Structure formats: structure tokens, C-alpha cells
Paper text:
The disks large homolog 4 MAGUK, commonly known as SAP-90 or PSD-95, is very abundant in the PSD and, in rats, has also been found at axonal juxtaparanodes adjacent to nodes of Ranvier. Knock-down studies have shown that the PSD-95 protein plays an important role in the integrity of synapses by anchoring receptors. The PDZ domains of PSD-95 are all class I PDZ domains, in which the ligand is the C-terminus of the partner protein. The binding cleft for the peptide ligand lies between the βB-strand and the long αB-α-helix of each domain.
A sequence of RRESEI corresponding to the last six residues (422–427) of Kir2.1 was chosen. The ESEI sequence comprises a type I PDZ domain interaction motif, and the preceding RR residues were included to ensure that a peptide amino terminus does not interfere with ligand association at the PDZ cleft. All of the ligand residues could be fitted, but the two Arg residues had markedly weaker electron density, indicating that alternate conformations of these residues could be present. Similar interactions between the bound peptide and the clefts of both PDZ1 and PDZ2 are seen. The main-chain amide linkages of the Ser 425 residue of the incoming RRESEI peptide make H-bonds with the βB-strand of both PDZ domains. In the work described here, the presence of a Glu residue at X−1 appears to be important in allowing an alternate peptide ligand conformation.
Residue numbers in the entry:
A (entry chain A): 58 to 246
B (entry chain Q), C (entry chain P): 422 to 427
């Protein structure tokens, strides 16, 4: 958390390009005098989003054999444009703050558990992220009364069934294929 | 994107 | 900020 990590990410160019936006350069330095090329946006449904490894605020250090640590904005764009159909990126990022994993036991009310979910493979709630997210908690429902679950929580598992890289419909099935008492594994920021 | 009730 | 689509 807060420390630098370095990663090789190879992307295959799709019809709409690599599927991300950049800012920075020696002539457009955002944040102090740091000339780094940064990712500012991951395009929904694009190559970077489907791959899932590239993150907003990652700094691109190399594009294939080209050093983009101290280049103009235009030089970076050109290097990415000319990089071919298989693009090998070497990036740097500050590790995000760690998430708290929590177990929550809920008893269903007459209207279920009282929350809504979004996300899944092909329905990413955040571009690049296949996780199931809580998007709504029903006033007066079981999740609300318990008080632990919150909007923006990630559902990792329901009872013994993992929800890592699953389709949205399977996440719903798993959450509805339950008895009255449900055990949830949850990731909080 | 989808949103479902649980 | 200058931003380019890649
Ligand atoms: N671990 C290998 C590779 C790491 C890597 O790919 N990143 C940097 C080296 S610090 C690079 O020059 N990448 C350009 C490339 O893909 O050849 C090494 O010792 O260089």
C-alpha cells in the first residue's frame, strides 16, 4: 500500500485500439514536474478493460523496446500507435490501500436480503474489474438492519460459492440459491 | 452493465 | 489537461 510496483502487461489491439487514454509527457506534465505518461481512463469493453490488469494512474515506462519515461506527449502517442497488434507495456503504479475482508451473516426478510448488485464478466461495474459490487441497500431491509454492508462493497463469496470472475446471471443465481440464513464474504475499502 | 435485486 | 485516446 503506497509503495511502487512494476508490471509487464501485453495487450492485443482491438478495432477501437488499446482501449485507454493517457496524459503527461515532458511538455504536458500533470502533477508537479513529473513528465510520466499516465493512464487517465480505461475504455468500457475495450482491450485494456477485458484484460483487467491496467489501472487508472498507472505510469507507462516502456512500450515494447521504446523508453517512454521522459518523452513528449506526442512521442508517447506515436509509440503506442506504431507498437503493432501485440503491445508489450511495462508499467508502474502505487499500490492501492488494502481492502478489509469481512464475513457477514444475514437473515432474509420477506423481500430477501435487501441489496442490489452490479458487475460480472461482460457487465463490468468499473472498467477493468469483473467483481460483483453492492450498488443499493434497501431502507429497512436485512442488509440495512444488520448495518455492516455498504454501497461499493464487493461480494467475494456466498456461502461456499466464490464469485470471482463470474457472469452477472451466475452471481444472481448463487445469491438466490440459498436458505433463509446467508453467509457473505465481502471486501470493504 | 446490469443491476439485480437480492 | 491534454488527454489522448489510445
Ligand atoms: N525482467 C526483465 C524484463 C523486465 C522488462 O521487460 N522491463 C524493462 C526492463 S527494466 C524493459 O526494458 N522492458 C522493455 C522490453 O519489453 O524489452 C529484465 O531484467 O529486464
Amino acid at each position: 500500500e503506497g509503495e511502487m510496483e512494476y508490471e509487464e502487461i501485453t495487450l492485443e489491439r482491438g478495432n477501437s485500439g488499446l482501449g485507454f487514454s493517457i496524459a503527461g509527457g515532458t511538455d504536458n506534465p500533470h502533477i508537479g514536474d513529473d513528465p510520466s505518461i499516465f493512464i487517465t481512463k480505461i475504455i468500457p469493453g475495450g482491450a485494456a478493460a477485458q484484460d483487467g490488469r491496467l489501472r487508472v494512474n498507472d505510469s507507462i515506462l516502456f512500450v515494447n523496446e521504446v523508453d517512454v519515461r521522459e518523452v513528449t506527449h506526442s512521442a508517447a502517442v506515436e509509440a503506442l500507435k506504431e507498437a503493432g497488434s501485440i503491445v508489450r507495456l511495462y508499467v508502474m503504479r502505487r499500490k492501492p490501500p488494502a481492502e478489509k475482508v469481512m464475513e457477514i451473516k444475514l437473515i432474509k426478510g420477506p423481500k430477501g436480503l435487501g441489496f442490489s448488485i452490479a458487475g460480472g464478466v461482460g457487465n463490468q461495474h468499473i472498467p477493468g474489474d469483473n467483481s460483483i459490487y453492492v450498488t443499493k441497500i434497501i431502507e429497512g431491509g436485512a442488509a440495512h438492519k444488520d448495518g455492516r454492508l455498504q454501497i461499493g462493497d464487493k461480494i467475494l463469496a456466498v456461502n461456499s460459492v466464490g464469485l470471482e470472475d463470474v457472469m452477472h446471471e451466475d452471481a444472481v443465481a448463487a445469491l438466490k440459491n440459498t436458505y433463509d440464513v446467508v453467509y457473505l464474504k465481502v471486501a470493504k475499502p | 452493465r446490469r443491476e439485480s435485486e437480492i
